[PDB]
Amino acid sequence: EVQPGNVTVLADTAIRGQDLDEARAMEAKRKAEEHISSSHGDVDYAQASAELAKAIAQLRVIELTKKAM
Amino acid sequence: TMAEKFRDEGRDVLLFVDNIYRYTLAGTEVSALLGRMPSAVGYQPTLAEEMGVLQERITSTKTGSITSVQAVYVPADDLTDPSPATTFAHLDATVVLSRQIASLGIYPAVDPLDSTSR
């Protein structure tokens, strides 16, 4: 899109097309008609979450300290 | 003894003892003066016999029955103190009250994860 004294290219980030977008939509539909889900790549969150899950496990603090809540 | 007399007449009786712990405590105070070496947390050596000789004659028989309710104080809220621990065995229904529940205003402050019945 070009203007008086200015111009812009609203570039696409991936190849677009009638067939490619329909293939992507077909996979997006299949993944929902099944119940198949992927794994996020946050290995840091995985490490910290498993460490905190194991550290917090089985520590019988409440009923050790007399805290009612 | 009066409960037993009413039992032997063939009747059925209710017996309410308002704090049985004070029966064992009054023994501890006296135990040392009688010249007996102290046991686990101070109690007399004869704690379990002093308790069983009483608890075992308060029972129903084929001539009459005694239904009894006993209050049982636990010192320092410690349910593992020798006296509550040795008293637990003599009861059919044990209702355990707790301070944590009472501080929530939830009366009667019974702990349902500790009360049980035969």
Side-chain angles (χ1 to χ4, degrees):
Chain A
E1 179 251 10
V2 47
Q3 291 267 16
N6 184 19
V7 53
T8 68
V9 185
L10 301 167
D12 287 347
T13 192
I15 305 290
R16 301 302 297 272
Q18 182 53 84
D19 43 320
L20 306 174
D21 292 354
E22 202 62 20
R24 279 188 280 242
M26 211 63 56
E27 174 147 61
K29 243 182 170 188
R30 194 200 76 246
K31 273 141 63 183
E33 75 104 299
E34 305 189 358
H35 292 79
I36 182 170
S37 324
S38 177
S39 84
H40 63 81
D42 201 359
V43 68
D44 285 351
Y45 167 89
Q47 275 271 23
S49 179
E51 283 266 52
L52 182 135
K54 274 181 285 188
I56 204 160
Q58 197 63 207
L59 79 87
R60 205 175 73 265
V61 53
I62 309 299
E63 95 100 34
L64 202 58
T65 177
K66 303 312 179 181
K67 176 182 263 143
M69 99 179 61
Chain B
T1 298
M2 303 169 185
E4 289 203 287
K5 169 68 187 185
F6 291 139
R7 184 187 68 206
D8 290 7
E9 285 179 13
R11 310 184 195 281
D12 49 22
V13 183
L14 264 46
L15 175 54
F16 299 97
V17 176
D18 191 17
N19 209 332
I20 201 76
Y21 170 64
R22 310 288 189 218
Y23 164 59
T24 79
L25 183 65
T28 303
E29 300 179 15
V30 158
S31 183
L33 304 179
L34 295 171
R36 309 194 296 210
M37 292 201 58
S39 91
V41 179
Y43 293 100
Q44 60 268 40
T46 65
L47 174 63
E49 190 180 16
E50 284 190 349
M51 198 186 309
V53 161
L54 182 84
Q55 287 284 359
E56 186 145 69
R57 52 186 281 220
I58 165 175
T59 52
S60 303
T61 68
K62 282 175 183 169
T63 181
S65 61
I66 303 178
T67 304
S68 62
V69 186
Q70 315 189 341
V72 187
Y73 175 99
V74 314
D77 307 335
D78 189 354
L79 285 165
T80 64
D81 186 288
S83 166
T86 50
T87 304
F88 270 103
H90 288 107
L91 303 171
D92 299 329
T94 63
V95 179
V96 173
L97 309 167
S98 74
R99 191 181 301 287
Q100 286 79 59
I101 303 177
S103 76
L104 266 46
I106 300 175
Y107 303 106
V110 172
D111 188 346
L113 297 179
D114 218 322
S115 303
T116 64
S117 176
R118 189 65 60 204

